[PDB]
A paper describes a structure:
Bacillus NrnA was crystallized in the P21 space group with four molecules per asymmetric unit. The B. subtilis NrnA structure comprises two globular domains connected by a linker region (residues 178–194) that consists of a short α-helix bordered by two loops. The N-terminal DHH catalytic domain adopts a mixed α/β fold featuring a 5-stranded parallel β-sheet at its core. Residues from the DHH motifs come together to form a surface-exposed active site that faces the C-terminal substrate-binding domain. The C-terminal DHHA1 domain of NrnA also adopts an α/β fold with a central mixed β-sheet and helices on both the apical and basal sides. The four NrnA molecules in the P21 asymmetric unit of our crystal structures display variation in the orientation of the C-terminal DHHA1 domain with respect to the DHH domain, and the distances between Cα of H284 (at the end of the GGGH motif) and Cα of H104 (in the DHH active site) can vary from 11.9 to 19.3 Å. NrnA from B. fragilis, M. smegmatis and M. tuberculosis are reported to be dimeric, and Bacillis NrnA in our crystals packs in a similar manner. The dimer interface in Bacillus NrnA covers about 1600 Å2, 11% of the total surface area of the molecule, and is centered around helices α5 and α9. Whether dimerization is a consequence of crystal packing or is the physiologically active entity is unclear. In either case, the NrnA active site directly faces the DHHA1 domain of the same monomer and away from the dimerization interface, indicating the catalytic cycle of an individual nanoRNA occurs within one monomer.
In the Firmicute B. subtilis, the ytqI gene product was shown to be a major nanoRNA turnover enzyme, and was renamed NanoRNase A (NrnA). We show here that Bacillus NrnA is a bidirectional nuclease that can degrade RNA fragments from either the 3′ or the 5′ end. We have determined crystal structures of B. subtilis NrnA in its apo form, as well as complexed with substrates. These structures reveal a dynamic bi-lobed molecule with the DHH catalytic domain and the DHHA1 substrate binding domains connected through an extended linker.
Author numbering: -3 to -1, 1 to 275, 278 to 311
The structure:
C-alpha cells in the first residue's frame, strides 16, 4: 500500500531517536534492509540519533558496523524491526521498550507485532522493500547515498542468489538496475560476498568427488565428525554447502546429514519435487527444508523415503 508506506515515513520524521533491529543469525537481506535503512536515515536526518543494533555476522561485517546502545537510549525511541517474522528471533530483545514499534517484513504475518506494520509477501526481500520505501520517501526529503545503495544491492543479490532464486521478480531487477548506477564497486562487493576459505573449498571438493546419484536422481551427503575434523570445517560451514549440488545433470532432490555436538542438522533440497512433506520433526519451503535427527538409523530411512519421493 502507498498510504501505508507514507505512514512509515511520517512516523520516522517524528522521532529524534530511531533504533533499528533485524533477526538473529543475520544474512545479507538483514544487513541490507536494517543497515540500508539506517544509512538512508543517517544521510537524510543528520540531526537524529540513529542506531543499528544486534550481534554482527563476521562474514558480512565488511558491509557495516553495528552500535552498542544503553538502555536509556530506548526511552521515547522509535524502534524499527526489519526482516523478522517472529518476535523471539529479533536480535536484541529490547525492541518493545521504545515509545513506538514499526515492523517491516516480507514473511507471512503470523506474528502481527508493531504499532505500524508493513508486510509485503510479494517482495523478494526486505532490502527491496527498503528501496521501494525510499522511492516514496524521496518526495519527503529522503536521500540515498552510495553506501546505502551498496547495502540495498548487497541485500537483494544475497537474498536472491544474484537473481537466481524464484523470489526474483520484475521489481527486483528494476531496482537493481537503479541501484547499480551509484559509484560503488559491484565486482568488489561480489568478491567479498563469495570469498570462501580454502578448507571449506576442499570440503566442497570432497563432497563433489564422492556424491552418487540413484536411478531416480536422488542423492545424499553424510558429513560425520571425522570428516569435519579432517577439513577443520565447522558443522555450519558444511551445511551451508548443501546448495552446491544443484547443477548436477539429472539430480532431482538431495539431502545433507551434518553431525553436530547435540544433533545432526539435516538439509534438504530439490530441483522440482516437493520435500517439506519429508514429517521428520522439521519442515520448511517446498524446495529448501530443514530438520534435526538422532541416529543414523533415522537418517537411513529418510534416504529410503527420498528415493521414493524421487521415483514418484
Amino acid at each position: 500500500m502507498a498510504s501505508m508506506k507514507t505512514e512509515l515515513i511520517r512516523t520516522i520524521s517524528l522521532y529524534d531517536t530511531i533504533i533499528l533491529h533485524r533477526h538473529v543469525r543475520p544474512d545479507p537481506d538483514a544487513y541490507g534492509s536494517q543497515c540500508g535503512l539506517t544509512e538512508i536515515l543517517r544521510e537524510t536526518y543528520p540531526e537524529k540519533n540513529i542506531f543499528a543494533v544486534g550481534t554482527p555476522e563476521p562474514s558480512l561485517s565488511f558491509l557495516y558496523s553495528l552500535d552498542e546502545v544503553d538502555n536509556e537510549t530506548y526511552e521515547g525511541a522509535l524502534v524499527i524491526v526489519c526482516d523478522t517474522a517472529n518476535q523471539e528471533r529479533i536480535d536484541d530483545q529490547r525492541y518493545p521498550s521504545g515509545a513506538k514499534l514499526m515492523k517491516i517484513d516480507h514473511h507471512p504475518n503470523e506474528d502481527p507485532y508493531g504499532d505500524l506494520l508493513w508486510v509485503d509477501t510479494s517482495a523478494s526481500s526486505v532490502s527491496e522493500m527498503i528501496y521501494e520505501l525510499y522511492l516514496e520517501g524521496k518526495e519527503h526529503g529522503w536521500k540515498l547515498n552510495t553506501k546505502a545503495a551498496e547495502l540495498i544491492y548487497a541485500g537483494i543479490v544475497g537474498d536472491t542468489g544474484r537473481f537466481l532464486f524464484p523470489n526474483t521478480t520484475e521489481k527486483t531487477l528494476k531496482y537493481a538496475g537503479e541501484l547499480i548506477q551509484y559509484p560503488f564497486s559491484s565486482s568488489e562487493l561480489f568478491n567479498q560476498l563469495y570469498e570462501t576459505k580454502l578448507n571449506v573449498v576442499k570440503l566442497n571438493g570432497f563432497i563433489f568427488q564422492n556424491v552418487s546419484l540413484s536411478e531416480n536422481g536422488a542423492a545424499s551427503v553424510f558429513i560425520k565428525k571425522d570428516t569435519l575434523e579432517k577439513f577443520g570445517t565447522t558443522a555450519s560451514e558444511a551445511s551451508q554447502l548443501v546448495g552446491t549440488l544443484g547443477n548436477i545433470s539429472g539430480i532431482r532432490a538431495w539431502v545433507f546429514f551434518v553431525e553436530e555436538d547435540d544433533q545432526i542438522r539435516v538439509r534438504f533440497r530439490s530441483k522440482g519435487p516437493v520435500i517439506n512433506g519429508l514429517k521428520y520433526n522439521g519442515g520448511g519451503h517446498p524446495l529448501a527444508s530443514g530438520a534435526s535427527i538422532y541416529s543414523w538409523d533415522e537418517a537411513d530411512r529418510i534416504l529410503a523415503d527420498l528415493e521414493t519421493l524421487c521415483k514418484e
